[PDB]
Amino acid sequence: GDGRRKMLSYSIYNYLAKKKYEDKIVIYLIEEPEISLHRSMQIALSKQLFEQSTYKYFFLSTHSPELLYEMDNTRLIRVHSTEKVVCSSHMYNVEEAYGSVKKKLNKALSSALFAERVLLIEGPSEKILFEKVLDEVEPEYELNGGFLLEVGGTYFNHYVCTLNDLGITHIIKTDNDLKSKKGKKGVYELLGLNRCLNLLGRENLDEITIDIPEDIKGKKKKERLNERKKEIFKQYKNEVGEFLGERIYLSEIDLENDLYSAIGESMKRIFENEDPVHYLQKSKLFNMVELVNNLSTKDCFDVFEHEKFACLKELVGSDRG
Amino acid sequence: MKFSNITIKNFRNFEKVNINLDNKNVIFGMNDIGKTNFLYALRFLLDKEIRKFGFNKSDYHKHDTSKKIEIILTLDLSNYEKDEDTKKLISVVKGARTSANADVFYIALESKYDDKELYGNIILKWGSELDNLIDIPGRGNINALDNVFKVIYINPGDGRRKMLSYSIYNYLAKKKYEDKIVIYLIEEPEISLHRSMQIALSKQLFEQSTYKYFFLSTHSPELLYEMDNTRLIRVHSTEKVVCSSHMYNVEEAYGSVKKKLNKALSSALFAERVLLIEGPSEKILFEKVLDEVEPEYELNGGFLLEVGGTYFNHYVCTLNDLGITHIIKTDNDLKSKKGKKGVYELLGLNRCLNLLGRENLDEITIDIPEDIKGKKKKERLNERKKEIFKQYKNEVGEFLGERIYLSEIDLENDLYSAIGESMKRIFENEDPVHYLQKSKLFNMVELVNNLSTKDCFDVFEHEKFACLKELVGSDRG
Amino acid sequence: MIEDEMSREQIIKDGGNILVTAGAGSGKTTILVSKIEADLKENKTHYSIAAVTFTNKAAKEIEGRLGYSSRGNFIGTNDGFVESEIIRPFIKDAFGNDYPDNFTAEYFDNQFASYDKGLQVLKYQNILGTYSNPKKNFKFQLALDILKKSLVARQYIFSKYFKIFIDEYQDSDKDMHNLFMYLKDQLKIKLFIVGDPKQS
Ligand SMILES: Nc1ncnc2c1ncn2[C@@H]1O[C@H](COP(=O)(O)OP(=O)(O)OP(=O)(O)O)[C@@H](O)[C@H]1O
Ligand SMILES: [Mg+2]
Ligand SMILES: [Mg+2]
Coil, strand, or helix at residue C125? Predict the structure, then answer.
């Protein structure tokens, strides 16, 4: 048959390299090892290729994202598809702080290494909304080398340094958050602004505090936190402009307030409430599916040619000039 | 008009295998299991260049050469009007059709070994009944089956030459074979192909009308990103060769989320045991626990599938018709209705009851004082979820018998039931559950940064996390 | 250029029913084989044509003028076309398995002139006779009866046969005209009829 003959031939070559060539320096040159191979055998070959010490020196050409699931301490070379043949090199390492989330990062980055323009989103609600909008506007976005990459609970530097060293265009759409500290009441740290300032090459900002009355909670406490986020986004305006020059797109409050700025009369029509923003934020997965089941054409274009959604126009690549 | 069935008896690794078919068939499976021996059964039936050499000793089941090789194909033929291919079949056959059985057709292949000339002669037949199959008439090297079907077999600088050769094969099928029924047999088209070209081949193969009939064998999940109106065939890796079939369709209710479902399910079709979870927080926690306990789980055929904002029926029907083990871990939720205050619906219990084969329950109504909000409202809702989980106990037991695992309140309360001393140690609060539930994507990373060995085992051998022991597959018996 | 090429564009590129008011003979065979080779040139699908004559000498002369065709085009007499295309593949599907498949036309002994005694001597003696009236056709009436009876015969001659080219219509019976009208009106087959100016 196939496959097991190829995996037999790998063990024949590794047995001949272990036995006959103890006195020599062995370099493997592997040309496309995913051919006629199951993906579980690709993950097994990836674990043997990056974890074991029997492949000390190799050069690997591949087309498969599932065979880069175990990558660490390697050198990634990308050949660019431009008019001049440019090779870009990156020394890929995974840090000791990221060792508990290593497999998630390697699967997500290993699918994204074979792209040209990568949009970095937070969770699956952005994936549902942007897949509906990019299905209705430009449905061949992934044929042309676009990618959607959900990066949750991380500080963006690993993905941006790996894609920036390889010549792959990274776009980040995010929002500024006020995370409450553990063991402390009333003191909120600026999460999204420190993530974007850490991407720009700055230090982390100081922990701000805001005081509320104790009976004031519920929807009113979220409105006080929203106007506090609006005052932070107003006062740090020249940092937001140089985030915007470096393809970092910070929202004022959330994604939902930008969507209410774009398609908010349709959101009042669908949800039939006076607060369509709060109703989607009560349950984010089920109400985004309920919203994208009821949008159509000329709502997705209202999302796409809005000024708060220029990350999608960067991802497609259509320019006026 | 339409393929319906193929029955393969006493061939190379098929003893008696019956497969329901359609147009646009996609077959998948493991290595050395018989994917390309399925396509050689179609080459020996319908292509003359394979059929002219006969059968060897090695084409018989377990080198026996005393049984008869029999390959029978069933055609549907129910639409005589408006389809030109039914007229293309009916104008050649002329004498074995019956008006009482005018909406079925059979093309059969028989072979008995000689064991003097050392040769297996192939005799082809058609008919409209399974008894009285007359021989296909022919003169010389040409019979009348070759006047109907034309079989194009595709098997692969590089890359751009193969996509040129696809256009050469489609140009020759558009120009020279207008009067014939064309069947494509494609054997692994992901070889030396970039993944954008695989998505482009998937879109051309499933959306355009230039591939009316094909049989596709593949190993690549990116070439099933656009699958719709197809027949999925899985060859099982057991001690007996079993082929399962599913008629894959995407509903009109799921048409706005079709690409997300197709990417998530197309990665999950190449597995053996699939766990269905809700979001990425379960993915982060289960990837940390399965990294610490059984780190070769995806080598052995396990898969973590995040499904969100759906009703579980599409994935369970596709994985259950293909013979793939599906495990669902979920939690019961009280979703608030739009335009109505105080009336909730029982969302996780309705999802499990819709999976089991029942109807949705009635909308419950719980009322609260208006000043009582914040953390006390969530405690009243958790006590209402506990009363729902206590009163529907015999439904929860038969969810548990069908590998559905419904939580009492949430994942986080089960995690506090397992490792909650360590959750008190890490978060240093009196409420470790609520601090985890404030920012879910950042405190789960903060939690799994600080766990180690014997906390992941306390997650793993707990009785509220038997879905992980189902996903790995380790049994005491 | 001008009216000669315009008249050739009219008389070559037709697609409908053809009825030419021309005499018997006088070069009709050359324009018939020119129409047959123009219809074989102009067709690109899987359909096939039929040619019906009376004598075997004109049939082998037409087979000499065409040569070889691999499209399944039938050229022959009317009794051979009815016997090999209508009667023999569909008698077992129309009237059951009691009637024989193979049969020979021997009309030198039986002179029976009724339909009921004809059907009981195909049932019992398994041979066919001829009528005492010479303006009769038992085989064409049997072909019309089993084309009215069978569904798959109508499906086969709707799927295969496209046009029928008829020669020597001046000496014909009304049953052949009834069967050709039954092929014309329902199953959509064009007709090419040559004839006579007056009497002859
Ligand atoms: N005559 C025979 N008798 C018994 N077993 C046979 C015979 N011919 C083939 N086989 C078996 O059938 C299998 C042939 O593998 P095959 O190439 O069909 O698999 P596959 O699923 O297409 O593989 P891959 O995924 O690696 O491309 C082997 O297990 C072989 O032992
Ligand atoms: Mg194979
Ligand atoms: Mg190459």
Answer: coil
Name residue B378's amino acid: K
Which of A54, A50, A45 lies closest to A75 in space, CA to CA?
A: A50
**Could B97 and C45 be called an inter-chain contact, meaning their C-beta atoms sit closer than 8 Å?**
no
- B50 Cα to the center of ligand 1, angstroms: 18
Taking the C-alpha atoms of residue B32 and residue A1, their distance in angstroms, rounded to an integer, is 6
Rounded to 5 degrees, φ, ψ at C137 are: -145, 105
Q: Which of A100, A152, A286 sits opposite B288 (nearest CB)?
A: A100
Phi first, then psi: give them for residue C120, nearest 5 degrees: -80, -20
Q: Is A298 left (phi over 0), alpha (psi -120 to 50) or beta?
A: left
Q: Does C84 touch chain B (CB under 8 A)?
A: no
Which among A18, A42, A38, A19 is positioned nearest to A30, based on CA atoms? A42
Tokens 């377990």, residue located: B62
Q: Are the C-beta atoms of residues A300 and A132 closer than 8 Å to each other? A: yes
Please tell me what DSSP assigns to residue A21.
T
Q: Please name the residues in contact with B103: beta carbons below 8 A apart, sequence gap of 6 or more.
A: B76, B77, B78
Secondary structure element (H or E) that encloses residue B166, with its range: helix B160-175
Place of tokens 């013979």: B323
Structure tokens at A168: 């792959």
CA B301 to chain centre: 14
**Secondary structure of residue A217 in the 3-state scheme:** coil
Angle, CA of A177, A180 and A182, to the nearest 5°: 145
- B400 to A158, B89, B302, B327, B356: CA distances (angstroms): 42, 52, 20, 10, 11
Mutate which of B188, B235, B256 to test chain A, going by most A C-beta atoms within 10 A? B256
Q: What single-letter DSSP state applies at residue B223?
A: G
Q: On the CB side of B89, how many CA atoms lie within 13 Å of its CA?
A: 27
Instruction: Establish whether C58 is an annotated binding residue.
Output: no
Residues A37, A33: Cα–Cα separation, whole Å: 8
Judged by 3 or more CB pairs under 8 A, whether C touches A is no
Give the DSSP letter of residue B62: G
Atom of ligand 1 nearest to the CA of A36: 27
- Does the beta-carbon distance from B88 to C151 stay under 8 Å? no
From the centroid of its chain, how far is CA A48? 27
**What crossing angle do the helices spanning C138-149 and C115-123 adopt, rounded to 10°?**
80
3+ Cβ–Cβ pairs closer than 8 Å linking C and B: yes
Experimental method: cryo-EM
Which residues partner with B61 through β-bridges?
none
Which of B437, B409, B265 lies closest to B349 in space, CA to CA?
Answer: B409
C-alpha B125 chain-centroid distance? 34
CA–CA distances in Å: residue B322 to residues B16, B232, B247, B272, C10: 18, 8, 10, 10, 61
The CA distance from B432 to B422, in Å, is 10
Task: Decide if A229 contacts A252 (C-beta within 8 A).
Answer: yes
> Six-digit token pair at B340?
């109505």
Q: Which residue has the tokens 């590794």?
A: A14
Tell me how far CA of residue A53 lies from CA of A15, A17, A24, A50, in angstroms: 14, 13, 16, 8
Q: What is the resolution of this structure in A?
A: 2.8
Closest CA to B270 of B308, B291, B300: B300
Name every residue whose Cβ is closer than 8 Å to that of residue B380 and which is 6 or more positions away in sequence: B366, B368, B372
Handedness of CA C108, C114, C119, C124 (dihedral sign): negative
Chain B residues in contact with C46 (beta carbon < 8 A): 87-88, 91, 179-180
Instruction: Map tokens 């419904």 to a residue.
Output: B406
Other CB atoms within a 10 A radius of the CB of residue A312 amount to 24
Give the separation between CA B137 and CA C155, rounded to whole angstroms: 20
Token pair of A248 as six digits: 């970092």
Q: Which residues of B318-328 are buried (b: 16+ CB within 10 A; e: fewer)?
A: bbeebbbbbbb
